């Protein structure tokens with residue numbers, strides 16, 4: 001049992017809140033926080049940059065070692081690394097960068113990684129700088145993830161639209 005509070009129920013297993021994922025992670029200290037990564041684990045902005053800053057760059061230092069050993073992730077792929085001061089683990093998941101021509105269908109493959117974890121605190125993959133339509137990302141999440149996922153949506157206007165949309 002985690003201390004997640006104030007979430008709206010979307011389905012049996014998907015919950016959503018208008019909150020900063022960093023704030024939620026700091027408060028709840030979940031087993032798994034999801035990062036919306038790129039294949040190089042270069043955590044520059046959005047969720048990745050905010051999570052990394054909250055770890056005082058430890059996430060990036062660890063990611064540099066991961067890449068030196070293993071090479072880049074696949075689009076739609078993932079790896080499990082430490083959650084540092086935020087969570088037990090961080091699941092780094094790469095959604096497609098639709099703005100750079102990558103196939104939106106890989107967003108389903110990306111969300112499938114969530115099924116390897118019983119409970120996750122997560123963002124909407126690909127819905128920010130990667131350019132996927134946010135409601136599409138939410139619908140893929142709902143239709144793909146079967147484990148318990150707590151979605152933190154930073155943007156208030158976006159949240160209000162998402163929770164008023166069919167799934």
Ligand SMILES: Nc1ncnc2c1ncn2[C@@H]1O[C@H](COP(=O)(O)OP(=O)(O)OC[C@H]2O[C@H](O)[C@H](O)[C@@H]2O)[C@@H](O)[C@H]1O
Pocket residue numbers: 019020021022036037038042043044045046047048049050095123124125126127128129130131134152153154155
């Ligand atoms: N602190 C936050 N808390 C919750 N949601 C957030 C936060 N910041 C952004 N969002 C929302 O989270 C959603 C995802 O936005 P993005 O983080 O861009 O992820 P992507 O998968 O599209 O792009 C991946 C790149 O982003 C990084 O640069 C990586 O290093 C990658 O190169 C949007 O709805 C945001 O409003």
